[PDB]
Amino acid sequence: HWGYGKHNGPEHWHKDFPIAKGERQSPVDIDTHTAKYDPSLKPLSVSYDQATSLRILNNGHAFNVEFDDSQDKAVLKGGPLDGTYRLIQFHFHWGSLDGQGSEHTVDKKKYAAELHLVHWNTKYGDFGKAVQQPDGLAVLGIFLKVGSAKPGLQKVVDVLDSIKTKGKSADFTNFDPRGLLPESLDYWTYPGSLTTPPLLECVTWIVLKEPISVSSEQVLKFRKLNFNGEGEPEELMVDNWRPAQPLKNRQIKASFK
C-alpha cells in the first residue's frame, strides 16, 4: 500500500504507478521569474455561495471535506478553464515542521501546508470519468503559512478529534469554503497530475500567489491526526506531501504582472 513512509513513499510509487515518471507530473517548483504573464488568461470565477459540505473523512493519506457535487452548487470557472468545474472535496498536505509541508514550491520555498480544492469538469458527468481525461480536474491550490489564525479554518480543526484514524468520518455540514481563500485570486497555472496515486495526468493546476495564514495551534492539530486505523500502531499523519517533480515540457503561466 503506497504512503509517505520510507518504505512506501514517493520514491516507491512508480513501481505500482509508472505514470509517476510521466510527462506532466505534479507538484512542481514554480519559478516565479520564468513563469510568463498571459494577458489572455481570464479572472478566476470561484462561485461557492451555494456549496453544500456533507462530511469529513480521514482516508489514511489526508482528510477530505466532501461536498454534494450532484448539482452545480460550488463551481470554478474562468481563468485557464473552458467550461464548468464542480467542487467535490478539499484537503490539505502538511509537514511535521513549519518549514515544510507544501507540495508546490515557489522559487524553492516550501510552505507549512497546502490546501487543494478539487473540482471536476462537468462535461464528463462524474469525478471517476473526469480523472480519465486530460482536462478532467481543476485543483485550486492555496499555500498556508504559520502566523495569525485563519478563523474560517477553525471549524475544520475542531472536528479532527473525531476522525483521528484512517477510515473515520463525521458529519460536516454547512461549512463555507469561502472562509479558506486569501484576498487575491492572482494565480499561476500549468497542466499536471494528481499528486497521489494513481497520479493521473488529468489536472489543470491553479495555484494562488497569496498564501493564507493559519496559526501554529491550527497546524499542530493537523499533526495530531493518524495515518493508521484505530487499534493499529500509531503513526502521526505528517509530511503527507509529494516533492516537486520535473517540469519537463511545460510552461507555467501567471495571471498577473
Ligand X SMILES: CCCOc1ccc(S(N)(=O)=O)cc1
Which residues are identified as catalytic? 61
CB nearer to ligand X: give 5 or 40.
5
Q: What cell does 191 get?
A: 497542466
- Smallest gap from residue 118 Cβ to Zn ion (A): 7
Query: Is 116 part of any known ligand binding site?
Result: yes
Binding segment for Zn ion (CB under 5 A), chosen from 27-35, 111-119, 224-232, 248-256, is: 111-119
Alpha-carbon span 132 to 201, nearest angstrom: 8
Alpha-carbon span 192 to 25, nearest angstrom: 5
The bridge status of strand 105-106 relative to strand 169-171 is: unpaired
Verify binding: residue 110, Zn ion, rule CB under 5 A.
no
Judged by CB under 5 A, which of 77, 116, 119, 166 binds Zn ion? Answer: 116
From the list Zn ion, ligand X, none, which binds 166 (C-beta under 5 to 8 Å, kind-based)? none
Which residue has its beta carbon closest to Zn ion? 116
Query: Is 91 part of any known ligand binding site?
Result: yes
- Smallest gap from residue 55 Cβ to ligand X (A): 16
Q: What is the 3-state secondary structure (H, E, C) of 5-28?
A: CCCCCCCCHHHCCHHHHCCCCCCC
Size of the site for Zn ion (CB under 5 A): 1
From the list Zn ion, ligand X, none, which binds 8 (C-beta under 5 to 8 Å, kind-based)? ligand X
Q: Are 18 and 186 within 8 A, CB to CB?
A: no
Alpha-carbon span 138 to 144, nearest angstrom: 19
Burial of 155 (0-12, 13-18, 19+ CB in 10 A): middle
CB nearer to ligand X: give 81 or 131.
131
- Among the listed residues 113, 114, 73, the one whose alpha carbon sits nearest the alpha carbon of residue 95: 113
- Smallest gap from residue 33 Cβ to Zn ion (A): 26
Residue with cell 507538484: 27
- Smallest gap from residue 31 Cβ to ligand X (A): 20
Give CA angle at 182 (179, 186), nearest 5°.
140
Residues that bind ligand X (CB under 6 A): 1-2, 8, 12-13, 15-16, 116, 118, 131, 139, 194-196, 198
- Smallest gap from residue 147 Cβ to ligand X (A): 24
Q: Are 193 and 10 within 8 A, CB to CB?
A: no
Q: What residues are paired with 44 via a beta bridge?
A: 78
Query: Is 12 part of any known ligand binding site?
Result: no
Binding residues: 91, 93, 116, 195-196
Binding residues for substrate: 195-196
Binding site for Zn ion (CB under 5 A): 116
